Symmetry: C3
């Protein structure tokens, strides 16, 4: 048939990382970023923060379809992300870089997101390994919330209090779609924050969330 993941492509001898066009179960094309280097390679990347050039404080319609630049930061979009994580079993990996260049990460057994009707519900496996600690199981079975759509289990607005979008609760222990605040920041838990990573007051330089059939 044809390539359906970055796993396929790597196996087919595409060894350099970059944008490749894979085929959704639905088929229908869809060009994605492939990380062929990290942890044996073949990861499809749906989120990337690198320099704070793209504004992530976006609404529902935008997160649905995705936004950003293949040239920089981006969200692959929730419909795509669902299509992508729906049919085998993908394992999520997160990669975080502080402004020292100390890498830290988190690996998870499985990773699925429900369709838009299910509100892009997070179905997270269990923390495997990762020097950044588990700052995401906390958000299991919890709908995705955006500025123009409050779904969080909180009386106020998590998306707005911490200026981001996430599967918020009351509210978060992770906030990778938050403000790009450049290292330690006075403001509270509103940067690119990994609770168990560098706490609620440090915003990483680099954030990447990627998948790969386990």
């Amino acid at each position: 048939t044809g390539p359906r993941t970055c796993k396929d492509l790597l196996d087919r001898g595409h060894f350099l990382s970059g944008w490749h066009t894979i085929y959704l179960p639905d088929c229908r094309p869809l060009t994605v970023l492939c990380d062929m280097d990290t942890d044996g390679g073949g990861w499809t990347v749906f989120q990337r923060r690198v320099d704070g050039s793209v504004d992530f404080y976006r609404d529902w319609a935008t997160y649905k379809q995705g936004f950003g630049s293949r040239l920089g930061e981006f969200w692959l979009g929730n419909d795509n992300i669902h299509a992508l994580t729906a049919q085998g079993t993908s394992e999520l990996r997160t990669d975080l870089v502080d402004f020292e260049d100390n890498y830290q990460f988190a690996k998870y057994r499985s990773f699925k997101v429900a369709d838009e009707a299910e509100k892009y519900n997070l179905v997270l496996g269990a923390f495997v390994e990762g020097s950044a600690g588990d700052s995401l199981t906390f958000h299991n079975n919890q709908s995705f919330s955006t500025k123009d759509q409050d779904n969080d289990l909180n009386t106020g607005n998590c998306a707005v209090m911490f200026q981001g979008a996430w599967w918020y609760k009351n509210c978060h222990t992770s906030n990778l779609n938050g403000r790009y605040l450049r290292g330690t920041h006075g403001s509270f838990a509103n940067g690119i924050n990994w609770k168990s990573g560098k706490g609620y007051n440090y915003s990483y330089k680099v954030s990447e969330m990627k998948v790969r059939p386990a």
Copy 2:
């Protein structure tokens, strides 16, 4: 049959459900395929970007032939080329937006009702519609209905050579008030108006960090 069944613009591609910026190949009026950068993010999406400065890696002080055909890198800085820019904006009405960024991460912009450049025979004459809006202020209306000039081909209205004088390439009049193809001078410079300058923006003595020029069907 791909000339017939492909997209004509970055707008078409947005319509067909490409929401990420990047290089897509579109088909020009003469059926010729061309790979352009689509900015799908800014002010609505569907812009075809034709110039981009960002880090000063590419040298923009080039002769006529090179501006004609295009030069640079999809990976970074670039000019799409005068023939292409003309073919883009010939049959139809396209609006132009200018995006700018300084070294303290201020974003500004300027937008224009229409934007057309003639063919080479007409020396890529600029035909600029009215200023719509922008925090950058207007620094392009001044250059309306002027020829494009390079160092090795002078078509301005200055007794001298603007392109040489201000080390760029533009629809120079006498001489300029914007100079987005000037030297990558990195913030405030001591040299006069030879940077990537937008006069109503940060004047003749500050060169921006980023510049982008893009078109969308009006």
Copy 3:
């Protein structure tokens, strides 16, 4: 389209990833430098920011590694395939941390297949402000940390943290560590000895081929 020069001829004036066809007609996406010295160069190595680790083994250099988005080594099999039929000039481009440019050029450039240990076959130096720091390495095997093929009793890949056609050991070390300017450490950076010497590591390095 069989090379980047073909593509330039067909009106592709911007540098970027295009897919060409290997002489056996296998497709391969390569970086085409359409700007330098007349354009048409297929790029097979690139350092620029120090984000990729170049201190790799034989398998990894054989197949290629890195990102289209940044730094990479096209892979030895591909570099062989590319320089297999005909004659290809080599250009080495170097940029320092004051943005000064230096280059080197060579009449011809060929690397043998894996059997002959990706042996280096180089033509005459023609010119370049970096000076000739590659001829010294002509007719040598490629070495990595795990497969030592040099003419030194020790391991050169390990001694100078890179991968090259090491003799005893090197006068160029472009796959060395990204050390960022002048370094006290001896000869283990992105080093071109006739250029900035054994103690300066360049900001940018590119190695490219084009039909002669």
